[PDB]
Enzyme design. Sequence first.
Site, PDB file in Angstrom:
ATOM      1  N   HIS A 144      -7.685  -0.518  -5.070  1.00 36.47           N
ATOM      2  CA  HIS A 144      -7.469  -0.142  -3.674  1.00 36.47           C
ATOM      3  C   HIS A 144      -8.394   1.015  -3.320  1.00 36.47           C
ATOM      4  CE1 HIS A 144      -3.630  -2.294  -2.456  1.00 36.47           C
ATOM      5  NE2 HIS A 144      -4.002  -2.872  -3.577  1.00 36.47           N
ATOM      6  N   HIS A 153       0.846  -1.177   0.000  1.00 34.60           N
ATOM      7  CA  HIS A 153       0.000   0.000   0.000  1.00 34.60           C
ATOM      8  C   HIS A 153       0.897   1.247   0.000  1.00 34.60           C
ATOM      9  CE1 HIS A 153      -3.602  -2.313   0.950  1.00 34.60           C
ATOM     10  NE2 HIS A 153      -2.909  -2.945   1.905  1.00 34.60           N
ATOM     11  N   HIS A 211      -3.632  14.584  -2.759  1.00 38.14           N
ATOM     12  CA  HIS A 211      -3.893  15.590  -3.795  1.00 38.14           C
ATOM     13  C   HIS A 211      -3.502  16.994  -3.371  1.00 38.14           C
ATOM     14  CE1 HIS A 211      -7.213  13.233  -6.217  1.00 38.14           C
ATOM     15  NE2 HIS A 211      -6.089  12.519  -6.132  1.00 38.14           N
ATOM     16  N   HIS A 216     -28.011  13.443  -5.245  1.00 36.47           N
ATOM     17  CA  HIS A 216     -29.317  13.603  -5.879  1.00 36.47           C
ATOM     18  C   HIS A 216     -29.413  12.885  -7.222  1.00 36.47           C
ATOM     19  CE1 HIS A 216     -33.332  15.233  -6.454  1.00 36.47           C
ATOM     20  NE2 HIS A 216     -33.297  15.874  -5.291  1.00 36.47           N
ATOM     21  N   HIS A 242      -5.525   9.094  -1.185  1.00 35.35           N
ATOM     22  CA  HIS A 242      -5.897   7.724  -1.472  1.00 35.35           C
ATOM     23  C   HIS A 242      -4.654   6.869  -1.727  1.00 35.35           C
ATOM     24  CE1 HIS A 242      -5.282   8.019  -5.867  1.00 35.35           C
ATOM     25  NE2 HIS A 242      -5.839   9.219  -5.780  1.00 35.35           N
ATOM     26  N   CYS A 243      -4.846   5.547  -1.625  1.00 36.76           N
ATOM     27  CA  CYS A 243      -3.786   4.616  -1.968  1.00 36.76           C
ATOM     28  C   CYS A 243      -3.692   4.554  -3.496  1.00 36.76           C
ATOM     29  CB  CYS A 243      -4.139   3.256  -1.394  1.00 36.76           C
ATOM     30  SG  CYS A 243      -2.879   2.004  -1.560  1.00 36.76           S
ATOM     31  N   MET A 299      -9.803   2.700   0.271  1.00 39.18           N
ATOM     32  CA  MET A 299      -8.568   3.357   0.664  1.00 39.18           C
ATOM     33  C   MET A 299      -8.500   4.793   0.183  1.00 39.18           C
ATOM     34  SD  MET A 299      -5.551   0.537   0.905  1.00 39.18           S
ATOM     35  CE  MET A 299      -4.682   1.536   2.105  1.00 39.18           C
ATOM     36  N   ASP A 334      -1.174   8.801  -1.695  1.00 39.88           N
ATOM     37  CA  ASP A 334      -1.117   9.947  -2.600  1.00 39.88           C
ATOM     38  C   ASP A 334      -2.032  11.015  -1.998  1.00 39.88           C
ATOM     39  OD1 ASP A 334      -1.928  11.851  -5.013  1.00 39.88           O
ATOM     40  OD2 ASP A 334      -2.233  10.052  -6.284  1.00 39.88           O
ATOM     41  N   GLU A 372     -28.954  24.623  -4.511  1.00 37.83           N
ATOM     42  CA  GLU A 372     -29.837  23.511  -4.152  1.00 37.83           C
ATOM     43  C   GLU A 372     -29.027  22.232  -4.102  1.00 37.83           C
ATOM     44  OE1 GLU A 372     -33.045  22.500  -7.192  1.00 37.83           O
ATOM     45  OE2 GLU A 372     -31.825  23.783  -8.568  1.00 37.83           O
ATOM     46  N   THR A 373     -28.218  21.984  -5.145  1.00 42.18           N
ATOM     47  CA  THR A 373     -27.469  20.745  -5.332  1.00 42.18           C
ATOM     48  C   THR A 373     -26.121  21.191  -5.884  1.00 42.18           C
ATOM     49  OG1 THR A 373     -29.493  19.567  -5.765  1.00 42.18           O
ATOM     50  CG2 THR A 373     -27.454  18.567  -6.661  1.00 42.18           C
ATOM     51  N   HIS A 382     -26.910  17.144  -1.898  1.00 43.18           N
ATOM     52  CA  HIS A 382     -28.099  17.944  -1.684  1.00 43.18           C
ATOM     53  C   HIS A 382     -28.588  17.735  -0.243  1.00 43.18           C
ATOM     54  CE1 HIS A 382     -32.061  19.741  -2.710  1.00 43.18           C
ATOM     55  NE2 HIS A 382     -32.532  18.861  -1.894  1.00 43.18           N
TER      56      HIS A 382
END
Lengths: 334, 334, 334
Positions: free
Chosen positions: B138, B87, B92, B299, B127-128, B143, B90, B272-273, B248
């Site tokens: 993964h 494993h 971002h 939604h 995340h992996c 993950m 990373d 709204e969304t 939402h």
Amino acid sequence: DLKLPRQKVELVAPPFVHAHEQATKQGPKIVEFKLTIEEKKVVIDEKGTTFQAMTFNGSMPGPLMVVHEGDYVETTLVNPATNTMPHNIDFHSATGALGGGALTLINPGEQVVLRWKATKTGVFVYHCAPGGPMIPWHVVSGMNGAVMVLPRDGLNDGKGHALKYDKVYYVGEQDMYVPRDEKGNFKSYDSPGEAFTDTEEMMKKLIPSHVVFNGKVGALTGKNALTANVGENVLIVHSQANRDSRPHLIGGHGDYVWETGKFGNAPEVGLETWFIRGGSAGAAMYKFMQPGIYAYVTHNLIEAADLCATAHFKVEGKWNDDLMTQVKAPAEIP
Amino acid sequence: DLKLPRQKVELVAPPFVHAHEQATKQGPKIVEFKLTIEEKKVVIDEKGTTFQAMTFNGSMPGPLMVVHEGDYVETTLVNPATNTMPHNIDFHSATGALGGGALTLINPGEQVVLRWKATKTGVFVYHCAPGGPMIPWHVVSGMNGAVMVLPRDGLNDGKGHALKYDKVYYVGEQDMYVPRDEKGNFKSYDSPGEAFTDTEEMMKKLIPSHVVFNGKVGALTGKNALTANVGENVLIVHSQANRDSRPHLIGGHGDYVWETGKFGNAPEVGLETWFIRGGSAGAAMYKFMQPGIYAYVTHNLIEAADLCATAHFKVEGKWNDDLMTQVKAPAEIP
Amino acid sequence: DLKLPRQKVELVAPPFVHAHEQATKQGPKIVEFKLTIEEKKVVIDEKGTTFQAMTFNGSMPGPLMVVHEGDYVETTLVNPATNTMPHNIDFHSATGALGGGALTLINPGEQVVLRWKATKTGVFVYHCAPGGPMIPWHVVSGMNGAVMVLPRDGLNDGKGHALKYDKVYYVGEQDMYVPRDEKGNFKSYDSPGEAFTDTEEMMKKLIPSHVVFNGKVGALTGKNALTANVGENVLIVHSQANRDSRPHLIGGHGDYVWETGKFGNAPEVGLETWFIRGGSAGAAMYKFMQPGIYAYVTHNLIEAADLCATAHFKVEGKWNDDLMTQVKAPAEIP
Ligand SMILES: OC[C@H]1O[C@@](CO)(O[C@H]2O[C@H](CO)[C@@H](O)[C@H](O)[C@H]2O)[C@@H](O)[C@@H]1O
Ligand SMILES: OC[C@H]1O[C@@](CO)(O[C@H]2O[C@H](CO)[C@@H](O)[C@H](O)[C@H]2O)[C@@H](O)[C@@H]1O
Ligand SMILES: OC[C@H]1O[C@@](CO)(O[C@H]2O[C@H](CO)[C@@H](O)[C@H](O)[C@H]2O)[C@@H](O)[C@@H]1O
Ligand SMILES: O=N[O-]
Ligand SMILES: O=N[O-]
Ligand SMILES: O=N[O-]
Ligand SMILES: O=N[O-]
Ligand SMILES: O=N[O-]
Ligand SMILES: O=N[O-]
Ligand SMILES: [Cu+2]
Ligand SMILES: [Cu+2]
Ligand SMILES: [Cu+2]
Ligand SMILES: [Cu+2]
Ligand SMILES: [Cu+2]
Ligand SMILES: [Cu+2]
């Protein structure tokens, strides 16, 4: 205890929109609407495929309701005894009680009156949401529409300039899930209840059989094409209550676009294609510059051309050769 | 050579977030976190469906890490010998070496320490990503988590005004791919390795069997509903490491929304969304105005109601009849 | 009657872009381009899967055309007699006649010349659109590219500051629909016509078999990796003519992003992942800070790793330990 003037609206079927003011000198009022639920079997394509629809006021989408910021919207929701299921209404424009859904559940033979204050500007979805697995089923069966809450000063571009539309259309996009039998033909059903088990199984696989505007393949083509003239500023409200869409006006643009649909935000300018998130409405305005036919599509072109999601505009006026010209017509290669 | 003060954080399981300051008078520090990978078979639905999960710190999503712009984030990643696979991690939020992935690959029985400078504000996925086809596997096995990098002056609305939240929740959404056997029951497997071939075949068809918040259908309902009071400003961080989502709040709004999740950009208002692009986190804040139950959903209502993607809020306080009222309760039609 | 200077452009194959000025002191000109349609069977993956492609100028995507606001773009479209189908071209940057499609339909053996005025700035899709069900089929067969319309003063950040790129790459993403036979192998066909029935059936199910950059799995890796140096500002134009994408630079960011692709709007800053709506192009610029390999992906990681949608950058320069460092290399757990 709320002592404001009352104003009734006569709703009209989409893609048209009931008469309203953009900028207004009226103060808040209680604006009164009636929606009558209709469950009905309808034809959704040119091959005669049928569909167990569930609608507000008989149409897919339900009609556009237009009010101004600070108005109170008082809706009488009616579920006639000729229907088979309970229904309700959730307004994304409203605050509290699941949008109104928790206050509006009505059995066949009943009606209810809900009032909400329009504190948020923009275009918003409304839809049925009776509870649990019924929620997606009623929505994808057609039970969704939109409401537009205008600023009292009308629309603006975010840089001080008014944006006034000459006309507005409401395009409701509907993802539909029609099961097939073993040999591959679409199934027909005698009631929404009978359609439920097969329809839910298909729904959970997340691929629609049809994606349509105004309830049917070809609804907004031919005699029922949208229209404009060169020089006209047209507002196109687009909703999708369950699934994303990517509107595009073929041969035009979005001059001013609220893709998230909310007028407290400035519009973006000069778009080719915009994005309506499932569960929302957005709006785009365009001033037509050229006559002729335009297509208004979702720009998943498979959905547009093959699953039903194409409307036309027919535009009158004078061709502008400065903007575009065919310098040499098709000819044999030298 | 980096001579800054060191501060340890005790991570907490989602949807809660470890204690932190919004605006701070502290200067940069080295903020120390530990993540311990756990592979484990878990139950993901109320029918008892099992799933071969792979997690940071035992949870789906992994915990939210919160720091300020200009801090250095020093993570000890631990892969105990009780796990079966290599494993890595990373971020971002980080710059270089595939987000840290190229510096953190650890076999069972190993650990590694990575430090990165938090130069970008916002909420970000981690995340992996071990390499090749293992990367999606993964991630969709669980993950993934998020990290929030706050401005040192806290959040603002882009017009000069501070935005302070009273509480923050982290909703991690997970698309899961559980194969079915011939008669249509979900399969169970003895190890992640054994689940791999059938799971990859399903993954490549791009339709999840389940879409859940906090690792399970119903995780954020009942005793574990999210809570607030009328008048409280709540920040909801939403991540999706692999697939789009459209959050939402049913009966509410996004008062201030960073849908792309990055605080160098002003928030949008009154949504709204909103839309979380697969591979990102976003954030929305809302001041509750009405008591009662709210649902927080994606939604796509089929995903929400039928595939698992619904959370509840229980909100205490006084009902506001000006905002919404049931004028006439359900009654027989005249 | 249009009396402006004429300038020919020699187009180059993606991901490279023909030479052009960012800011210019030239006034409007008529910029002349030629596109020659090629239908051809190509290999799209490392297993040797074949595909009936239809292309502008032999490539997927078609080449990037670059002009400035107020230029007139005069395109000679050529459909040699060696092709089997009619073709045309629709420019999303153009106004009128379905983007030019209604003026450019050419049979094999014919050519046509279209001129349009570049009144809208940004990056825009162009694609074939012959009519009806042929529209999606020609697009997903490869018949799409992009055109970039720059402001005459070059790009800016929306806050008064110029943004100048050191290089630009064009990444065209293509969703492909290759049917399988009964035992599960990809089918091969002798002509686009022969591929049509099976390909349409698959297309309508909305799940691609492959999602590729520059026409093939691995196209932008190895010898053909994208390149940069630390300190270089790189513009990445990304298009998708039919289906959404979510670009992400693994180990980097989008420093300035026009996700809707239109330069009349300020860029967003500091993104992790952005969103290209199907039917559009967008653009992101990033100044590299760290050497090494980066991957540029759609962050549906299943599509990226398993269906083909990964490019690499190879970046030269000096590692920055302040931004990121491996404090302790992998070691046995104490
Ligand atoms: O012909 C009988 C044979 O057909 C299958 C489908 O392969 O089932 C069909 O016939 C059944 C009996 O009439 C129907 O109930 C069924 O709905 C229909 O598909 C087989 O299951 C059966 O052995
Ligand atoms: O009953 C045998 C018959 O069933 C099929 C499925 O239609 O396969 C089943 O039985 C096989 C032998 O037990 C299993 O290996 C297989 O996994 C199971 O689906 C046919 O393939 C077979 O002819
Ligand atoms: O072996 C014959 C048997 O196979 C099926 C597939 O289950 O069809 C195969 O054989 C047919 C005759 O050769 C082919 O036309 C068909 O394309 C192939 O799949 C059955 O339909 C048939 O009974
Ligand atoms: O023929 N029934 O699906
Ligand atoms: O009609 N051929 O030039
Ligand atoms: O029964 N096996 O998929
Ligand atoms: O309860 N009926 O009016
Ligand atoms: O084997 N034909 O699909
Ligand atoms: O190599 N083990 O510490
Ligand atoms: Cu209903
Ligand atoms: Cu809703
Ligand atoms: Cu892992
Ligand atoms: Cu990632
Ligand atoms: Cu073509
Ligand atoms: Cu198009």
